[PDB]
């Protein structure tokens, strides 16, 4: 169905300022809007979006209000300026998914049979991506219901277009990477990976702590996946693995040795050239 979704910075800025301008008026918690984008093969692209009047009550999670005519006429109005765009799904800025999401998704599945839900965090505090992508599906199991509606995650990333790229480059004057080389290849890849892995393990720790003491709704799929995780850890004490590891490392170090030798030779040549060329400049002054 869907493999990857790509998000442009334009919709992010639109989400941010919509949240600001609607939350300044009063103490609302969640806001809703509709996205526009394009399809190609199994890859989805999001270009722009517009807001919509939405109301929800904190007293109960079964009462809420959206506007149909607003959405219809606003889509018709954006049609007259660019016909390539089309309705693809909706977004809500909630920190975490709510109970009513299934109902709203069913409500606006009429305009797009393959609606995709997107969650944007407006005040991130970590290095992770602010966007999360979900798609509805029907799940089946042993007993309880033949089918049940459930969300499933889809990989998301932030893309860029040429004009958008030059705009965001002009906007990001203060912050720019120091060097491109082993620096950006090391810190941006390895340390952040350790951070993310530790965070994930902490979250699963928290859920496991919630069980066998507290609420205790023992679920079995999580247990099956945990067994699969704990069974897949390799063993590094095997003799053959150690021998192969040593062989490959010894094979690899020779190349660095050779490159260092070449660099030393080039440095000596440069020193000779500079000294010879510069020693012949003092006598010209007389």
């Amino acid at each position: 169905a869907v493999q990857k979704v790509v998000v442009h910075p334009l919709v992010l800025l639109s989400v941010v300022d919509h949240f600001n301008r609607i939350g300044k008026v009063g103490n609302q918690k969640r806001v809703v809007g509709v996205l526009l984008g394009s399809w190609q093969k199994k890859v989805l692209d999001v270009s722009n979006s517009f807001a919509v009047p939405f109301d929800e009550d904190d007293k109960d999670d079964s009462v809420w209000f959206l506007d149909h005519d607003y959405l219809e006429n606003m889509y018709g109005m954006f049609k007259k300026v660019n016909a390539r765009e089309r309705i693809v799904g909706w977004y809500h800025t909630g920190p975490k998914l709510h109970k009513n999401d299934i109902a709203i998704n069913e409500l606006m599945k009429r305009y797009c049979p393959n609606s995709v839900l997107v969650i944007i965090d407006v005040k991130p505090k970590d290095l992770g991506l602010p966007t999360e992508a979900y798609i509805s599906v029907e799940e089946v199991h042993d007993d309880g219901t033949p089918t049940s509606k459930t969300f499933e995650h889809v990989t998301s990333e932030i893309g860029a277009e040429e004009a958008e790229e030059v705009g965001v480059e002009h906007l990001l004057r203060d912050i720019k990477d120091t060097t491109v080389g082993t620096l950006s290849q090391r810190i941006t890849n390895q340390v952040h990976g350790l951070k993310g892995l530790n965070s994930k393990l902490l979250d699963i720790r928290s859920y496991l702590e919630k069980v066998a003491t507290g609420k205790l709704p023992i679920n079995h799929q999580i247990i099956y996946q945990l067994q699969d995780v704990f069974n897949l850890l390799p063993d590094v004490s095997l003799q053959e693995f150690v021998k192969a590891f040593y062989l490959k490392t010894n094979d690899q170090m020779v190349v660095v040795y050779l490159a260092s030798l070449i660099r030393s030779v080039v440095a000596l040549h440069n020193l000779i050239n500079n000294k010879i060329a510069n020693r012949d400049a003092e006598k010209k002054e007389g």
């Binding site: 910075p9 941010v16 991130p124 991506l129 350790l194 892995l197």
Partner: peptide, 29 residues
């Protein structure tokens, strides 16, 4: 002149950032 604030600028610098998976793969041997 262009008016800049901290929130949008902090949000906008997430471009081209990669997941924690991409920094732990060790490529084919």
């Amino acid at each position: 002149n262009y008016r800049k604030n901290e929130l949008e600028q902090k949000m906008l610098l997430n471009l081209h950032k990669k997941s924690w998976m991409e920094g732990l793969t060790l490529q084919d041997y």
